[PDB]
């Protein structure tokens, strides 16, 4: 993708997060855990749900095809007509295949810029408090209790605390 | 410790395609391409099409003694004829101006038809030996019903002079027609007088047939041609008929009661007894798709027709392996 | 200390669309649709439109009375008629390729009017009581100025023979036609022949008119009909008349002086006394937006029209609460 | 946005700055103040101007209604005529509300990527001589002097020195 | 010690436009706009065009005597004709549905003329004499090959009553015509009877001609004309030809052997013995590109038709300086 | 560009980099030398390609020309017959013309986000281990010899070993 993230440097996504779209995955000493991250997650919910009714009403109104009788001296009229209502099929047809086609691009590049601003913004509240792995992962200097975790997820996450 | 941020995946095996790749599993996707319908041909909102199975738009209008299921049809939601309809023209002929009539009948759903000459009226002319084999009914040669073929009385065939004032209010379909004979021996024969004529008037129409003869082949068993005429008669005008042989008088017009959204639909189907919103030559449709690809000549409330086998939208992101 | 970077917000509450979000604020946009235009029918830069006002195109081209005043008529832009003129033909009739003649106009900026039939030429006919109630002009009987109504001088009418050599050297639109009486008896009454016909040939033109007799409802207070004839005679070449009734006779044929870019408006709409570089039916458009939405059919250095109440682009970027 | 930067990490614009789309603030012992980035506006303003240009001339040659008469036993060829003036309509209506529609949010992701684009720049050059505070600003180790604020908006931060 | 990452350069100077940014140079790009032809007509698939040259279709089918190279034409791929070719109708006239028929040859390759109504065959009337100096073969007044401009022998035009029944297993177009005379007196002189007929009747063909007279500009030195109908009949289908005068017979007609993908191409070009697989209006067209921007009317397996000057493609990146 | 790599922070591209078009330069002791990154670049041929031939037969089926021929008072329907084949023509042209413009743009920008995902990969292998110089390049604190850079290019760099 476009922004890195998905298959990317974030190998691969989680069939054990199944409350959301991108979130967070924690591991300390009292557990571990999958937490959904709501308002990245309704974020891309929204921007996706207008995206198909856009898309939907941008093709509500499109050319329509009338039954006409031609008889046998009447040939170039009926050759007319029928080209013409065939030529705008082909044009109607190619833009829906073409729209479809190109905003399911920019859909799975939406998704790989939503993961990657939530990677990032984690990264920008931890700063050098936690070791960058490389892998979507962060690990912690300090020993990160699950208020320290839900601190993170808060955005809340108090640096001076833990520097 | 550590925190991770990752994305959501599933054992979902929808693809979709884009510019760059194709064939690329997601998540959550949406198709928007209705592929299927019924098969069936079926009442729109309820109401009936008229479907004239073996009969065709001229058959059933002139009255073709075959078309007797569709003698006061009721109305119709849309039409259904054939692509070559054997009971058109029973006896060999043309319809005039045939293709600008089926036009009109698209901006219509129901006829009422009304006698404006009795077909008794005819005391003068012989009205009931109108006849021809090529127009069998129950065995007995017959003839297109809402027309009166008059032939001579006692070896006379006097001028005809008849006038129809339309005092409803509504536009009234008008038919009627000449016959063109094999030979002048056979024009004698029918109707006395060598050279004949029939003239039409109304507010706007200002017409004059002559009867054409000439050697022609055997159509349905005659070499003899009928050539049908039609107008719009508007309410408070009179037509005005005059001629002195070859006449093809009209006992019925079709009185127009209601104009609405119509279309007559071309299908070999026939009727399934089932109710749709959206309906195609092939078949009826009921999804919420804002496409489809069954047949682009619809009526109803329908998706959109596009050519394409597949329409899918990726909703959800990337699945993994 | 520090230094932060970010981007600029204002005032601005111009919001715009896109696939994913609607309705969003930026601080800058540009508007490329004109909705606006000024209501009136228009000159076009500078050249008059010819406003027919109550007459119709055919009216205006015979000379029908009440179109008096356009009698030769000065250069166009372009042409604005009326849905339904009340004053098109006058005397009961039909006009022959009328459609195929406006078509015509479109390609025509400036007719120059010349009489190629002088009236008092017909010497051998009577040309002065060529009249009907039909067409009054200032009380009395009056008919198509453009047009000669012959009759019969004395009980007879001698067969007409005339040509015209167009050595002007323009293309010439010619008119005329022909009568359909009610009966036999109006027949002889006019022009005495029971047979009649009007030949005309040119180099490319080879017909031969003759009238059609039919009872017919009183339009106008008539129930007699004329059908008009027309061509476009070629330079260097004559045009010949023939006929022995029922005769139409051109006096004035239209010289086709320029040709340009025109066409006929409709339009319910008057005149504004205004000038434009665009116009349309329901008024005219001075913008250098790219776009508008007022009417498709345009004339002159126009925008694009299409169907959008609204199209703005994002200049700037996404303005802060 | 797709890049994250414009109501992202940077939560909200500056009505401050009126000399340009993106920029700086400083903030000293002798002062503060806003700067706007030349380079990036104008190269913002040039894109955008191609870009509006380049819509309107792909739009300048599209179909033309002409006005055309048929009689009342011409009706099928009215119609066919109406239908096809008509259907021209829709697809350049279509086209223009679907462009600008996909061209308007290209515009505002590419405003959002020059502010991004401008925020690394600036990051580049300072490298770990200031703290990243996660908001768009860095807060530097050394007191920085009002050249040495023009330094990092020149793109001549001398690290060496502040190191 | 260091590693950095980078991106190819190279001595490209090809460039690509896009929305924002125009003349953008690339290091790789795909042009995929063909703008070249070899500027020749060719023949298709191996199969040879028809070229009327000065001949026009009308020419060719009626046998106009300057049109000799095209008796028995072979199959061909397309057909060419000049805008206004000469050879045309030699005696002046019109071609009944010209255009209809010309459409009708776009699903044709190859015709077989065969005789059905044998010159010699007209024993009763005399055939050798119905020559016009408008036509001339090698000094000598000749006519269309093909029909035969029957007049009366020894001052007597009897009827005429002539049948051909269509026994191949293939539709036949079938030819014919009518001499429309300058005066009553040329009527009487050629065919005698004053008031003449012709009846064409088929299964579905019921026509009956009458000539019209007219004085008329005088075209290739001639003020008379000629009008040319024509039908398809077809298989074990009789037409029947009934005439007292003013009759162009039928000598031969044209036969439908094979039915496919054909043009009538329009170009002033001859021909460059040169083979293709796209040929246009103004060449042949030999590429992989799936565009081109030569001439909108193509024919055989081509790429698509656009108004650009210019199609790149960006395939790789931007190119520093 | 959108992705701020190309002539964006990496000021120019490699002349002398042939056999590929993403990859590393290194320099230490024992010389210097351009390495194509294979993975990246064979994404980018395949990505490319694809692009070329869906855009290919997308524009395949479109409205065709034909030949029709009408007489001197069949006026109206000729033209009607003449704005019917030219406003597919203008449509048509509209398309491949647009489509190429757009995704043109969009090409230009995909090399630009493959450099700078190329870019972000090698940095997150080497985190704080070298010195990020803002010009595309990394400098050691750890002597790398040839391995030590194949190590890096190989997606292998180890981290612990050299921290
Ligand atoms: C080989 C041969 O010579 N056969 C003779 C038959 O041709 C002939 O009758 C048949 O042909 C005549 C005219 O040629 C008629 O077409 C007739 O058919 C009918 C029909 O049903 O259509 C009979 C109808 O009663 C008649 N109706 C009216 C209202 O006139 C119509 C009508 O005349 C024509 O269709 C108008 O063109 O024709 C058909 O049977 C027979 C018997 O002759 S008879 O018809 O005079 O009785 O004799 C054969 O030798
Ligand atoms: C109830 C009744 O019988 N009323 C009689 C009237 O019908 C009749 O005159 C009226 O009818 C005649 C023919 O039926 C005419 O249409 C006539 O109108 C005119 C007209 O103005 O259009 C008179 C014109 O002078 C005449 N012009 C020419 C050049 O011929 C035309 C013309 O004949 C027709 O238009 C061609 O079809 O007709 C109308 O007034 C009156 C008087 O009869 S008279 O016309 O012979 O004087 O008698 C009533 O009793
Ligand atoms: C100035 C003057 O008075 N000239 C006289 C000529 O008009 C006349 O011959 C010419 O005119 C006649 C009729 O007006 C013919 O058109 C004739 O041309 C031909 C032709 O080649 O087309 C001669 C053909 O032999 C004839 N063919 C047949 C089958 O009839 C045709 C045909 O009649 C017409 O085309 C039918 O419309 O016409 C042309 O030469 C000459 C000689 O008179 S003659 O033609 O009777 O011999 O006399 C001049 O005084
Ligand atoms: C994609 O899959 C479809 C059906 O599952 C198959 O027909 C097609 O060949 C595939 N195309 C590619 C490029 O893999
Ligand atoms: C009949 O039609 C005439 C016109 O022909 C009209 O004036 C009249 O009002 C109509 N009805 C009656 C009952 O007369
Ligand atoms: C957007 O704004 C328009 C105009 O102010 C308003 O009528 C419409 O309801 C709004 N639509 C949405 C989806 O917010
Ligand atoms: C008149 O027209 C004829 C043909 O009808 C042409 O040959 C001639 O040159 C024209 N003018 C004169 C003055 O004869
Ligand atoms: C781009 O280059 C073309 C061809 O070299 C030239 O004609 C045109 O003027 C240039 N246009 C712009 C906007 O640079
Ligand atoms: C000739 O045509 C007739 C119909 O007119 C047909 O019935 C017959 O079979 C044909 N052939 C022969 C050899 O009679
Ligand atoms: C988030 O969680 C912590 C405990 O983990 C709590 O003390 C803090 O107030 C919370 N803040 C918000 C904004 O939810
Ligand atoms: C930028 O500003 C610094 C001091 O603020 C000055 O010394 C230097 O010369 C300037 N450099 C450039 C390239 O403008
Ligand atoms: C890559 O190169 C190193 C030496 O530079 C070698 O030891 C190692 O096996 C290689 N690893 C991979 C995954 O290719």
Same mark, same amino acid.
Request: net charge negative.
């Given at each position: 993708?476009?922004?890195?993230?998905?298959?990317?440097?974030?190998?691969?996504?989680?069939?054990?997060?199944?409350?959301?779209?991108?979130?967070?995955?924690?591991?300390?000493?009292?557990?571990?855990?999958?937490?959904?991250?709501?308002?990245?997650?309704?974020?891309?919910?929204?921007?996706?749900?207008?995206?198909?009714?856009?898309?939907?009403?941008?093709?509500?109104?499109?050319?329509?095809?009338?039954?006409?009788?031609?008889?046998?001296?009447?040939?170039?009229?009926?050759?007319?007509?029928?080209?013409?209502?065939?030529?705008?099929?082909?044009?109607?047809?190619?833009?829906?295949?073409?729209?479809?086609?190109?905003?399911?691009?920019?859909?799975?590049?939406?998704?790989?810029?939503?993961?990657?601003?939530?990677?990032?913004?984690?990264?920008?509240?931890?700063?050098?408090?936690?070791?960058?792995?490389?892998?979507?992962?962060?690990?912690?200097?300090?020993?990160?209790?699950?208020?320290?975790?839900?601190?993170?997820?808060?955005?809340?996450?108090?640096?001076?605390?833990?520097? | 410790?550590?925190?991770?941020?990752?994305?959501?995946?599933?054992?979902?095996?929808?693809?979709?395609?884009?510019?760059?790749?194709?064939?690329?599993?997601?998540?959550?996707?949406?198709?928007?391409?209705?592929?299927?319908?019924?098969?069936?041909?079926?009442?729109?909102?309820?109401?009936?099409?008229?479907?004239?199975?073996?009969?065709?738009?001229?058959?059933?209008?002139?009255?073709?003694?075959?078309?007797?299921?569709?003698?006061?049809?009721?109305?119709?939601?849309?039409?259904?004829?054939?692509?070559?309809?054997?009971?058109?023209?029973?006896?060999?002929?043309?319809?005039?101006?045939?293709?600008?009539?089926?036009?009109?009948?698209?901006?219509?759903?129901?006829? &009422?038809?009304?006698?404006? @000459?009795? $077909?008794?009226?005819? =005391?003068?002319?012989?009205? *009931?030996?109108?006849?021809?084999?090529? #127009?069998?009914?129950?065995?007995?040669?017959?003839?297109?019903?809402?027309?009166?073929?008059?032939?001579?009385?006692?070896?006379?065939?006097?001028?005809?002079?008849?006038?129809?004032?339309?005092?409803?209010?509504?536009?009234?379909?008008?038919?009627?027609?000449?016959?063109?004979?094999?030979?002048?021996?056979?024009?004698?024969?029918?109707?006395?007088?060598?050279?004949?004529?029939?003239?039409?008037?109304?507010?706007?129409?200002?017409?004059?047939?002559?009867?054409?003869?000439?050697?022609?082949?055997?159509?349905?068993?005659?070499?003899?041609?009928?050539?049908?005429?039609?107008?719009?008669?508007?309410?408070?005008?009179?037509?005005?008929?005059?001629?002195?042989?070859?006449?093809?008088?009209? &006992?019925?017009?079709?009185? @127009?009661? $209601?104009?609405?959204? =119509?279309?007559?639909?071309? *299908?070999?189907?026939?009727?399934?007894? #089932?109710?749709?919103?959206?309906?195609?030559?092939?078949?009826?449709?009921?999804?919420?798709?804002?496409?489809?690809?069954?047949?682009?000549?619809?009526?109803?409330?329908?998706?959109?027709?596009?050519?394409?086998?597949?329409?899918?939208?990726?909703?959800?992101?990337?699945?993994?392996?």
């Amino acid at each position: 993708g476009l922004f890195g993230a998905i298959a990317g440097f974030i190998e691969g996504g989680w069939q054990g997060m199944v409350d959301g779209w991108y979130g967070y995955h924690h591991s300390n000493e009292q557990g571990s855990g999958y937490a959904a991250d709501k308002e990245s997650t309704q974020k891309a919910i929204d921007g996706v749900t207008n995206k198909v009714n856009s898309i939907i009403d941008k093709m509500n109104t499109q050319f329509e095809a009338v039954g006409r009788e031609f008889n046998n001296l009447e040939r170039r009229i009926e050759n007319l007509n029928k080209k013409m209502e065939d030529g705008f099929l082909d044009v109607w047809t190619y833009n829906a295949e073409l729209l479809v086609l190109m905003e399911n691009e920019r859909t799975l590049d939406f998704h790989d810029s939503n993961v990657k601003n939530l990677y990032d913004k984690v990264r920008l509240q931890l700063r050098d408090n936690a070791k960058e792995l490389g892998n979507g992962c962060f690990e912690f200097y300090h020993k990160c209790d699950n208020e320290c975790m839900e601190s993170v997820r808060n955005g809340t996450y108090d640096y001076p605390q833990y520097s | 410790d550590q925190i991770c941020i990752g994305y959501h995946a599933n054992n979902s095996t929808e693809q979709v395609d884009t510019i760059m790749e194709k064939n690329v599993t997601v998540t959550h996707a949406q198709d928007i391409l209705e592929k299927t319908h019924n098969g069936k041909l079926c009442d729109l909102d309820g109401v009936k099409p008229l479907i004239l199975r073996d009969c065709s738009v001229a058959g059933w209008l002139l009255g073709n003694p075959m078309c007797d299921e569709f003698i006061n049809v009721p109305e119709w939601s849309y039409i259904v004829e054939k692509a070559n309809p054997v009971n058109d023209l029973c006896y060999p002929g043309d319809f005039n101006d045939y293709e600008e009539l089926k036009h009109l009948l698209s901006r219509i759903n129901h006829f &009422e038809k009304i006698q404006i @000459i009795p $077909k008794s009226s005819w =005391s003068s002319h012989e009205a *009931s030996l109108g006849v021809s084999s090529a #127009c069998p009914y129950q065995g007995k040669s017959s003839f297109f019903r809402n027309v009166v073929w008059l032939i001579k009385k006692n070896s006379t065939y006097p001028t005809i002079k008849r006038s129809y004032n339309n005092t409803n209010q509504e536009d009234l379909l008008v038919l009627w027609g000449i016959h063109h004979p094999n030979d002048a021996a056979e024009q004698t024969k029918l109707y006395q007088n060598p050279t004949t004529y029939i003239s039409v008037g109304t507010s706007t129409l200002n017409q004059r047939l002559v009867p054409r003869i000439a050697t022609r082949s055997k159509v349905n068993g005659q070499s003899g041609r009928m050539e049908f005429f039609w107008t719009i008669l508007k309410p408070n005008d009179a037509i005005n008929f005059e001629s002195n042989g070859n006449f093809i008088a009209p &006992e019925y017009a079709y009185k @127009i009661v $209601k104009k609405g959204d =119509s279309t007559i639909m071309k *299908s070999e189907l026939e009727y399934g007894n #089932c109710n749709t919103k959206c309906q195609t030559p092939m078949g009826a449709i009921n999804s919420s798709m804002p496409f489809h690809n069954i047949h682009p000549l619809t009526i109803g409330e329908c998706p959109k027709y596009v050519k394409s086998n597949r329409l899918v939208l990726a909703t959800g992101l990337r699945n993994s392996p």
